[PDB]
Design a protein around this nucleic acid. Structure first.
Length: 158
RNA sequence: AAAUUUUCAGCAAUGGAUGUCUUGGCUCGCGCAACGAUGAAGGACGCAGCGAACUGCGAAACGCAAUGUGAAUUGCAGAAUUCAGUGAAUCAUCAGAUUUCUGAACGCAAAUGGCACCUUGGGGUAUUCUCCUUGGUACGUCUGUUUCAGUGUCUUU
């Protein structure tokens, strides 16, 4: 529902997550790992499934580039030339569920599921959730959720 | 050189400004005189075929009678008759009725459907018994009525 991009289609497919109950800043990190390989090329879908299942096992890890403060330094992030990293599990679930739906949309358009490539994943922030936290002295403080919107667009390579 | 930070643009997000609306407000002017012991205003509790509220109404309960208009109401249901009609309507009008429990509130009361007595008509060893049932019994005050009280002023049998 209003994507950011739009292959003349035929050769491309898309999926949208309207308002998921996950952390925005953690989904932002997963999505930046999925988007490209170690070279500048766009990453294959079979690779990004095989990645996100391994991040749930805590064997591969997600590098946190943008939102750093204060994430503990792990050896698995040497993979990305970057000291900080982390295994955001619930974030990997919703992104796997979206790519699962994005491959399902490709199966109607009849193209190779084996040759698919991630053209464009993006996370937007979503409207906030309201809750109450009670402070000493009778003060009341907001506690708030940050759900996010996830676009995915795929296509064939060659 | 990536990454990060900052800047500029494009697309997306977040947010509800600007613009255009408006059965509402505000102000001025002009008419009218109509609450209540024949129970007012206000309160409480109910009532719709399927409603919580808001409007309406009171066990006749989003209404009944009458009159006018003359075919709907509507979210769904049903009713179809109500269709050249002594008649559809969340219609208009409104002169006839209903109008629970309250409240000035009135038998005593009251965080109580509490506690009395009189009374009508009927229901079950009885004039005194219990029961259902109809309507009563507050305060002040005027005119009249009836019954009284006072070695108040007088006659007197």
């Amino acid at each position: 529902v209003k994507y950011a991009k739009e292959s003349n289609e035929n050769k491309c497919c898309k999926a949208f997550g309207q308002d998921l109950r996950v952390h925005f800043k953690n989904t932002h990190a997963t999505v930046q790992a999925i988007k490209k390989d170690k070279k500048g090329n766009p990453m294959k879908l079979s690779a990004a499934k095989k990645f996100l299942e391994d991040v749930m096992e805590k064997k591969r890890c997600v590098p946190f580039r943008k939102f750093t403060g204060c994430i503990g330094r792990k050896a698995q992030a040497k993979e990305f030339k970057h000291t900080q990293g982390r295994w955001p599990v619930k974030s990997c679930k919703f992104v796997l569920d979206l790519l699962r739906n994005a491959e399902s949309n490709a199966e109607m358009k009849n193209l190779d599921v084996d040759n698919l490539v991630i053209e464009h994943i993006q996370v937007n922030r979503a409207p906030k959730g309201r809750r109450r936290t009670y402070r000493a002295h009778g003060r009341i403080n907001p506690y708030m959720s940050q759900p996010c919107h996830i676009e995915v667009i795929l296509r064939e390579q060659e």
